[PDB]
Amino acid sequence: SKGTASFGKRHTRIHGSCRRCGKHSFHLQKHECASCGYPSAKMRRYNWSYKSLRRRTQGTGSMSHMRKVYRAYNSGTLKANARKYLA
Amino acid sequence: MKLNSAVTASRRKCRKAYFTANAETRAKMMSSRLSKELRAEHKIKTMPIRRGDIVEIFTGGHKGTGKVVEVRRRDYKICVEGINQKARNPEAKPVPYPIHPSNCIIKELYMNGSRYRAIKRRQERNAERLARI
Amino acid sequence: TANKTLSRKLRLAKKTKTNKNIPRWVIAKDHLKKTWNYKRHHWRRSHLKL
Amino acid sequence: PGLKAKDLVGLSQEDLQRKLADLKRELLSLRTMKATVPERIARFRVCKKDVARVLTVINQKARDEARAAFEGAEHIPKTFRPRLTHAMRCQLTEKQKRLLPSKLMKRKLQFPKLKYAVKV
Amino acid sequence: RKIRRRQTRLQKAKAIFPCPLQKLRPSVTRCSQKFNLTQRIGRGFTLRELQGVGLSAGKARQIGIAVDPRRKNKSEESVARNVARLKEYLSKVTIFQAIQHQGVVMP
RNA sequence: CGGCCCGAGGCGGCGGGGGCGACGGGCGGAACUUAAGCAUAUCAGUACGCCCCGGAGGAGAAACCAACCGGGAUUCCCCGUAGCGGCGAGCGACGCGGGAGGAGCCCGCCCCGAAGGCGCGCUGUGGGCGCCGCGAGGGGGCCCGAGGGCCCCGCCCGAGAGGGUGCAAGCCCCGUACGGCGGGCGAGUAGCGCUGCUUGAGCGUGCAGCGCGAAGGGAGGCGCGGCCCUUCCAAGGCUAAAUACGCCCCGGGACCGAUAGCGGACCAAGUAGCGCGAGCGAACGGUGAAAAGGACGCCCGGCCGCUCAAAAGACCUGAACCCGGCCGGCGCCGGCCCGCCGGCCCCGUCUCGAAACACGGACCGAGGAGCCA
RNA sequence: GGCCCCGGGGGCGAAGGCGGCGCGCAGGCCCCGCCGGACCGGCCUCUGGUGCAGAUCUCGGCAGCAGUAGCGCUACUCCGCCCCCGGAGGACUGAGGGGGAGACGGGUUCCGCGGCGCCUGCAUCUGGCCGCGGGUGACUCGGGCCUAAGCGGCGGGUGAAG
RNA sequence: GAACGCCCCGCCGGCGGAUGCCUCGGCCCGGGCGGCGACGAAGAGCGCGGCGGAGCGCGAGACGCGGUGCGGACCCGCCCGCCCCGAGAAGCACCGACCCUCGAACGCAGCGCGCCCGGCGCCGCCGCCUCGGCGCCC
Ligand SMILES: [K+]
Ligand SMILES: [K+]
Ligand SMILES: [K+]
Ligand SMILES: [K+]
Ligand SMILES: [K+]
Ligand SMILES: [K+]
Ligand SMILES: [K+]
Ligand SMILES: [K+]
Ligand SMILES: [K+]
Ligand SMILES: [K+]
Ligand SMILES: [K+]
Ligand SMILES: [K+]
Ligand SMILES: [K+]
Ligand SMILES: [K+]
Ligand SMILES: [K+]
Ligand SMILES: [K+]
Ligand SMILES: [K+]
Ligand SMILES: [K+]
Ligand SMILES: [K+]
Ligand SMILES: [K+]
Ligand SMILES: [K+]
Ligand SMILES: [K+]
Ligand SMILES: [K+]
Ligand SMILES: [K+]
Ligand SMILES: [K+]
Ligand SMILES: [K+]
Ligand SMILES: [K+]
Ligand SMILES: [K+]
Ligand SMILES: [K+]
Ligand SMILES: [K+]
Ligand SMILES: [K+]
Ligand SMILES: [K+]
Ligand SMILES: [K+]
Ligand SMILES: [K+]
Ligand SMILES: [K+]
Ligand SMILES: [K+]
Ligand SMILES: [K+]
Ligand SMILES: [K+]
Ligand SMILES: [K+]
Ligand SMILES: [K+]
Ligand SMILES: [Mg+2]
Ligand SMILES: [Mg+2]
Ligand SMILES: [Mg+2]
Ligand SMILES: [Mg+2]
Ligand SMILES: [Mg+2]
Ligand SMILES: [Mg+2]
Ligand SMILES: [Mg+2]
Ligand SMILES: [Mg+2]
Ligand SMILES: [Mg+2]
Ligand SMILES: [Mg+2]
Ligand SMILES: [Mg+2]
Ligand SMILES: [Mg+2]
Ligand SMILES: [Mg+2]
Ligand SMILES: [Mg+2]
Ligand SMILES: [Mg+2]
Ligand SMILES: [Mg+2]
After folding, report:
1. Which residues of D touch A74 (CB under 8 A)?
2. Cis previous bond, E69, omega within 30
3. Strand F nucleotides with an atom less than 7 Å from a protein beta carbon
4. Do residues B107 and B36 lie in contact, with contact meaning Cβ atoms separated by under 8 Å?
5. Which of E92, E88, E22, E85 is nearest to E49 (CA)?
6. If we measure between CA atoms, which residue out of D82, D1, D6 comes closest to residue D42?
7. B59: left (phi over 0), alpha (psi -120 to 50) or beta
């Protein structure tokens, strides 16, 4: 009775929602996330999984501030402002 | 032969430009001839089509003259008055056969302040060119 | 459970709120042929882990 | 349609604040009508945007006031400072980068640059 | 890359008109027993060579001559050949529709 | 009780922290694999893990190379054997020569002594390409659902790159060619002894721990001691260029054409779905020129017919395998007109030898394996 | 990449599909009839991801087998008129319940009205299925507080770092 | 014998989705550029449309607000709205603002609590205020 019967003894939550990455990966007993590594200050990143890397990275979200800053640099008045400051 | 190297001669890019164009470009893309009389008067060869212009059609199976009732810019076509699909009832409504603006010559123009001004702008620029050449 | 935290309540509430079909006037407006919203779910065969 | 930001420009702060209060209570009334007609449901749209315009104007006027209030101090609030990236704020000035020691500068003013041609 | 480098040297030539792109460099003897009897272009002129004609290091640098105070002459013929080169160049230079010399100067 | 010295709490201004599938710098660091076994060797000073900048970075103005009728900081490109090694398998620099680019300098030390950046400092400051806009020039006759088709006569051309338009368009429309604005010289050091790693560096290429520890010193591809010669000045610091590169934008191509090409051409792909989790991860493109997306009548879903060139009716074409209704008849080769007579084991494979009771193979479609350096 | 004698074949019908004759030892080629509805080549020189019966090959479709094998928990019947609802009868679960309620897990499955396209391996007018509206109220119940076994933090210490 | 099965002498139907033609997509090369963050980034959560599920966008000023220019008749359905020598729909470019919770994440915690009526995180540099010492001296 190590198969079907043993499967009927499951009424626990091992992992819950992470506050940083939002995934069902935060371990409720060790108090540490298995996807992004929270509460570590730095994010969990490994070069042996570039598919894991591409799933959540720069660009898969909104890029709101960086988007505005880049357009301002490439075509707006920002480098002129830099010249005025650096005078 | 082209010489300018910021302009594609690539069919994929040109077809994607023709679709997914923005509204101003699409409006400019929907132009047609002026007739000979308006060519003499305004000294201009082509205009963007508009509601309130009277159009004379050829080269199609729906040939005639009528006023522009609607402009279907997604399709790049115009719904003219009187030019319809043949209906089934004697009663049932008309249904316009959509004409493509390059199958027409504009016969009489809708005028307002902006139309007047943009025409005069275009004449002065063509005059700059004619003075250069 | 009858004893649930507000955060789990709110995420469950959003799943319930968004589990809906495409409006018919939206189908007419946007000129769609696909009319099923394939992000719907049913409680019997789902495994929402929220 | 609805109120114009130009027609709110040049109006007193209390006229503006009372007009905002009126618009807020109006959106309450209109939302109550929604939960309980073409003109009404158009007015709901126009009134959301009228609220937005009044608040826009109030903030702009207050900002101009404050930026005059702090115009010539040594320490400016960080909101009114130039718009520059982190890196630019941290870069050295062109004068600082072109500063030269005294002995180097003296020997550079001796024998400056010269235009000359060389023939075949 | 060929085009990129040509564009860069065109821009620099415009900027510094009517100076040449290159400095005056000395004539030196190749190092081996195998390359013993032929000359090539060196790095700079020695202070002994400059003392030959009068110029100081700063003055020569200003009028456009590479100067290498680390090199030492190995004989008197080195000096005679390079002083002839310096003397002739100082003959042929003008100082301010002018002509901008191209390529290496006095190959 | 005050000064100086060494500390403690608070306040103000300013700075740091995190983020990236490349390029760049510093550390730690495998095994598979090859040697036809396997220990040194190789793979490889690679994968991977940790730290750190930038638009480049690092390196850099000789304690250099050489042995010449000598060169002269750094980087990068072309070019080519000394040597290392169970001296096996393997491994491996560089100078001279031709080019790209080219640029040089200052602290300590010594003299003056607050002349300084003055609440500090005499335990030493200061001096010696992108933004705009104009833009030429074809009709007439047949026929088609539709003229970009056929026949006959023309125009523009600094423009016959191309895209669209109901069928192959320089002249039906956007564009294309020709132009305007912004523009006096460094000490727990050098070196040496023992040990560990690393290198082509071989009685030591470079580094390091520990013990010892200098004064004129370093180097000259075989050790030790002596005399010479040639050539440099370590143990402090700054520095442009020529060089390298993903993301994103721009242009091009003897590349792929929906089981191909990215996993991803489809209003909602790292999506739906699966795993406690780390993580794994699909399938699905195409009506018609126009939605004109199906009249009227009759039965009680069907029939008639309607739009359209055409149902192309949930859609381009529409093969095979397999099946239903009507009609005809009852395996390959050969002769004969035609159901007789004659001949004929299941291919592919390993094997001395296969019809084998040796193995693979129900059927059908599409894909599928000696190319490149 | 070229040529195709007033500038190669094409809605007066291209490619492809289905039958039929002819040519070639053969690989294959050519023509005709019907479908289809917009592109296609013969000769010279150049290039390659260039030819299938098999790999317990990959992906997709699919046959015979075959209307075959198969559809614990005692039980339904008559009438109004379906296994639904009502009335009458006959039984069962048998207080460690096929009863009444909580914890965990699920997440709207809850309620009313409507319905049968999917599901309800038979049916359905039933329904945890589908559509449209709704719905959970605290000074006194629990959580928030306390501490258990534990876990983290602490001038600092160590390690090439993490 | 019929029928079943099989072959096709031909004519029609199914099931399936090959072949042909097409392509707002991939891949390769080259050129640009090299522009984040405590002034709160990258990323995550939740919410926002007149009828509004997904994706894009936006942030309680929420399917967006203002200023300067250009542009000049539409706005996919149903509704509104605009229409004019300027009255101004679609669209474009810069600039000014708004900018909920978590996150280097900053009163503690993660959804519950404080100390105090301004507000209240850590490290470092330079100043300054208030202080300790049987350190050296007076
Ligand atoms: K079991
Ligand atoms: K964990
Ligand atoms: K509950
Ligand atoms: K469930
Ligand atoms: K920055
Ligand atoms: K290693
Ligand atoms: K190994
Ligand atoms: K081994
Ligand atoms: K081995
Ligand atoms: K080994
Ligand atoms: K070895
Ligand atoms: K080894
Ligand atoms: K060997
Ligand atoms: K040079
Ligand atoms: K046309
Ligand atoms: K010492
Ligand atoms: K030592
Ligand atoms: K070695
Ligand atoms: K050796
Ligand atoms: K020792
Ligand atoms: K020697
Ligand atoms: K050596
Ligand atoms: K030696
Ligand atoms: K795929
Ligand atoms: K075999
Ligand atoms: K065998
Ligand atoms: K055998
Ligand atoms: K056989
Ligand atoms: K055999
Ligand atoms: K046998
Ligand atoms: K047998
Ligand atoms: K057999
Ligand atoms: K065999
Ligand atoms: K066997
Ligand atoms: K075998
Ligand atoms: K067999
Ligand atoms: K190919
Ligand atoms: K069976
Ligand atoms: K019902
Ligand atoms: K350490
Ligand atoms: Mg546990
Ligand atoms: Mg081996
Ligand atoms: Mg090696
Ligand atoms: Mg550097
Ligand atoms: Mg080694
Ligand atoms: Mg694919
Ligand atoms: Mg079909
Ligand atoms: Mg078998
Ligand atoms: Mg095949
Ligand atoms: Mg192949
Ligand atoms: Mg075979
Ligand atoms: Mg009983
Ligand atoms: Mg119910
Ligand atoms: Mg059933
Ligand atoms: Mg109580
Ligand atoms: Mg949405």
Report:
1. none
2. no
3. 13-21, 47-51, 54-55, 61-62, 65-73, 95-107, 127-128, 130, 133-137, 145-148, 159-166, 169, 172-180, 231-232, 242-243, 247, 250-253, 263, 267-268, 270-281, 289-293, 295, 306-309, 314
4. no
5. E85
6. D1
7. left
